[PDB]
Amino acid sequence: SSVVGLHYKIGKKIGEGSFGVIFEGTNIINGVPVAIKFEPRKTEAPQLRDEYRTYKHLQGCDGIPNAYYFGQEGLHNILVIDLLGPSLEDLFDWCGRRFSVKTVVQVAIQMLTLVEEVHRHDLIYRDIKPDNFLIGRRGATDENNVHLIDFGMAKQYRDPRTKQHIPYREKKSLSGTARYMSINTHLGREQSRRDDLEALGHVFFYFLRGQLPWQGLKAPTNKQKYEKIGDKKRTTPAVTLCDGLPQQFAEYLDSVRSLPFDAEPPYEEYRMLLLSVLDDLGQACDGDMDWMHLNGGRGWDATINK
Template sequence: MGICASSAARRAGGSAGASTRRNGNRRRERDQDGAGEANRKRKDDRQAKEGGGGGGGGNGKQGGGAVPCGKRADFGYARDFAERYSLGKLLGHGQFGYTYVAVDKVNGDRVAVKRIDKSKMVLPIAVEDVKREVKILRALTGHENVVQFYDAFEDDSYVYIAMEYCEGGELLDRILAKKDSRYTEKDAAVVVRQMLRVAAECHLHGLVHRDMKPENFLFKSSKEDSPLKAIDFGLSDFINPGKRFLDIVGSAYYVAPEVLKRKSGPESDVWSIGVITFILLCGRRPFWDKTEDGIFKEVLKKKPDFRRRPWPTISNSAKDFVKKLLVKDPRARLTAAQALSHPWVREGGNASDIPIDISVLNNMRQFVKYGRLKQFALRALASTLDGEELADLKDQFAAIDVDKNGSISLEEMREALAQDLPWKMKESRVLEILQAIDSNTDGLVDFTEFVAATLHVHQMEEHDSEKWQLRSQAAFEKFDIDRDGYITPEELRLTGLKGSLGPLLEEADIDKDGKISLSEFRKLLRTASMGSQNLPSSSGYRNLRKI
């Protein structure tokens, strides 16, 4: 979405036109006349799109057949477009609509307008796509790095989406205009930071962009320091915590491994930003082949090459940042908010503009569901970590600790969990979470207690396996009092665990020998809070787009 007059916009519909342009691949399957089989397949795919159901947004509610002949959808939008705006020059067009510059009749401001033809919306899913895109733009409007949504209108023939007009061109054009098609580290960090802020905001709303790439970011103006704006939410969708998308969408060079495996979530946006960062810094794609299948094999199997020029001259901090975004295991990949706390991208930024990480809130919710032994084990692990390892969680703690007194109160916890989230939470549930995290029962959550409840264990192991071994062993030894290599029920009692210890021990005692070994303790720490997803996998690829 959004509008620009760059060469890319002129040749393909630009900004708001970009949405229809890129949605063409997605919507071609449901076009009219002769698309019956593709439409049926698309409908089935969409209904099974999110593992376990409950995706919100446009998931699972699409109707069956086509819209009755002669009947056009009523969206419930305002019908005074012609009184509000005058359409100007055509900027581009896509499969379902045209993009224009328009003038506000009241104040004379230029805006972007995407005009979508209702006669092309043959299937209910096409109607749902438009409604979802408007819903997404409404949810994100006000964020400085998202193209601003003004309003949606309709008449008997068209839907009109009015939004911010961006004149600075696509990020892709600026990359290509740079010497050797690459940015300096300082300039790249500024760009990447803005993309991460968009991703973090999306994820906080339970939204996944699903097609982050340079063409989907515009500059507001032609100035060098112009803000970057995210556009084209045509493939974006809402998802509930712990659920996974089962369909394959995106653009070939930027698609994450888990998307190809048909079990993706918000982490896929971070992978795409990692690919963009790689390109910004070296002028090449990290995964390339002459064919789409070849690209996918590279994405699934190959590691990025940091030995070729110019990588030896690029800072270790930048390389560390890119590597942590291009981790193939999504559980071990940095979240968007965590990436904003990384030293390389944070330089020039500050903690106050780092948003709350949706994964931190989700982890706190999951902590309540853990057995008491795992909660104790995580607290022990948290106590072994140093400042450098906790930089991102310090930022998150500071974001929630509004009065900056070094602890999180019930009111501050309530405020954090009352964000515009994809789930609602009762007051009693907020209190339950605070009480589970509050190990010393003083009614407050201090930083160590917070860390225990919000740790990303898979990241620790992936990013530095040697340090993980040392930290997890140190945590184990807090329970293994006699240092014989096992934790016994008596040692659990001595470290403060009360009540019946038999069932407690079973939480980690895999071989049922009545005690816990170091390997069993580590497996306990690794246990995924969401449980097994049992998601299907497929080698089929669809809706993937090359640049």
């Protein structure tokens, strides 16, 4: 019996994540494709249970796939949500590992809106990376809308009934991708809303420069590696990262880096700050992205790009 979840047939294997087993599926009642995620029950890291509850909490919001099923088939935990298109990292490589100024802007306002809606539901993401932001699929109304997925690192920062922020703390091991995590994350501080925004800043400069100065650093093990990445993050100001770039990015990273621990960040001020970038360059925020031009204008291909 290959079909799982009563109504979801296993299709292609696309599994990535942190070796988390991800599969293509389709709903045999209506043929709609889905993204099936596997997980061993008797494992050393149970997480798929709470990720199922996370999508339900953010259900109905734009950019969050709908949770359809969580079951106990065989010796695997199974979560069915919406299948989506490639990640921003996938399109990044295909666009020559560099994004134009127009694309990174319109992308940044969508990511900031997604992260705002996450914090609106009393959750922080803590796993900001372009591998977790996906576009829709071809032909759909949200084909180029940027979506957010993978909430296995989502932690509550305020209670839903007294809206009080958790207390500040320290001594937390450095878990995640060190290339984009905030400076406070390297220092072992308890993450909050401001750390999901500094990591967004790192991704913006990452898309702009094609790389980051704290990339490819050599160290014996990973602690010193994670440390050695933190030094360069604090050595280089935000202006030197904005070299030859619209200075509004330097302002964005500097602002979100001086935010206090429990403060609500001015989401719409940052998005408008990034909107004004298109004013100084004479461009219209119409939607046109870099990846709408590969392969003679067809879009993105599978056997040539990936």
